[PDB]
Design a protein around this ligand. Structure first.
Ligand SMILES: NC(=O)c1ccc[n+]([C@@H]2O[C@H](COP(=O)([O-])OP(=O)(O)OC[C@H]3O[C@@H](n4cnc5c(N)ncnc54)[C@H](O)[C@@H]3O)[C@@H](O)[C@H]2O)c1
Ligand SMILES: CC(=O)[C@H](N)C(=O)O
Length: 310
């Protein structure tokens, strides 16, 4: 019963989230936005740079937007290579979203990342409330973003919600600017060729989640009654934790492939992140439970990628 805008709509999450929202609420309620207008695209679409407050505001007020799912960002690897761009898009873009929400009395979904954490806090089952001392440019943007969001909630009364997503795995839109991207790439290349060159070492172990779980978590959190929530911008959220070679082994149980490990600069990013996450507060406050383990995710990835390679 509300007009919804999705920023970053053409990216890894947005490709799936826009369709989920159209189905849940109707096509007449969803507006998609990103930098460049796509050909052959069903959802209504408005182009915008998230840093352009004038155009962003216009899209919001001309479409009577009441809820924003804010996915626009620069991710961890692209951001480490261009730190000024990363700050500008992630922090100034978020501030534009928040200022607009305050003007127009909007509800928001503004995600964070497991990149908020650094190596000074536990790597296993990282708690919700530990200090956030990230060692990446992108992680610092996400910490600043959490704090800005929580100011807008407390000071300004804006109902902004967010999740520290783990690495997300999907087949519909292959990622290209992150660090957890190896997991997707490994699926794609295993099925397309039976070989992969992995950009992290074989023991790299990170929190991961299948996209259907991440999308469902997003929608469930957004549907929760506000008074049930003890956290706002920054829920920890968990599903899986595995190493690169463990994923290789799972994939190899379906298709012949062999993986070679050739780390690059993204190792130095991954090394600074936890292995797994304590998401009790999500599970307690709003009933989170993941549904896809590594086996089930692998079946879905491989079946769809095989189809796409026919
Ligand atoms: N594994 C993951 O995918 C993951 C994990 C944790 C957090 N997140 C968070 O989820 C959100 C979406 O991530 P994603 O993986 O879909 O990213 P993505 O890079 O696939 O999509 C982001 C989109 O933002 C757009 N964008 C970039 N700069 C822009 C600008 N100046 N103005 C407007 N649009 C701009 C891009 O064109 C892209 O389509 C981000 O906040 C990200 O930090 C993602
Ligand atoms: C840290 C993440 O979750 C993200 N996919 C990235 O690799 O930037």
């Amino acid at each position: 019963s509300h007009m919804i805008l999705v920023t970053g709509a053409l990216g890894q999450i947005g490709t799936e989230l826009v369709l989920a929202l159209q189905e849940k609420y109707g096509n007449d309620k969803i507006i998609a936005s990103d930098l460049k207008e796509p050909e052959n695209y069903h959802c209504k679409f408005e182009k915008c740079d998230i840093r352009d407050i004038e155009t962003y505001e216009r899209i919001n007020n001309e479409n009577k937007i009441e809820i924003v799912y804010h996915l626009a960002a620069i991710l961890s690897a692209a951001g480490e290579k261009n730190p000024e761009l990363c700050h500008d898009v992630n922090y100034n873009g978020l501030e534009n979203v928040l200022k607009t929400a305050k003007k127009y009395n909007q509800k928001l979904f503004c995600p964070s990342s497991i990149a908020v954490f650094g190596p000074d806090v536990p790597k296993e089952m990282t708690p919700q409330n530990v200090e956030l001392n990230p060692k990446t440019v992108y992680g610092i943007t996400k910490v600043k973003g959490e704090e800005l969001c929580d100011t807008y909630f407390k000071e300004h009364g804006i109902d902004v919600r967010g999740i520290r997503y783990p690495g997300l795995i999907s087949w519909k839109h292959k990622p290209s600017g992150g660090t957890t991207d190896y997991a997707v790439e490994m699926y794609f290349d295993a099925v397309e060729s039976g070989k992969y060159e992995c950009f992290v070492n074989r023991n790299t172990r990170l929190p991961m989640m299948f996209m259907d779980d991440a999308i469902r978590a997003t929608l469930e959190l957004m549907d929760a009654p506000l008074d049930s929530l003890n956290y706002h911008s920054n829920y920890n959220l968990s599903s899986m934790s595995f190493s690169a070679e463990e994923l290789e082994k799972e994939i190899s149980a379906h298709v012949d492939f062999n993986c070679l490990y050739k780390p690059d600069y993204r190792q130095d990013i991954a090394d600074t992140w936890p292995i797994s996450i304590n998401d009790d507060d999500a599970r307690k406050d709003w009933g989170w439970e993941p549904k896809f383990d590594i086996s089930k995710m692998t079946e879905e990835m491989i079946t769809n990628l095989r189809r796409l390679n026919e």
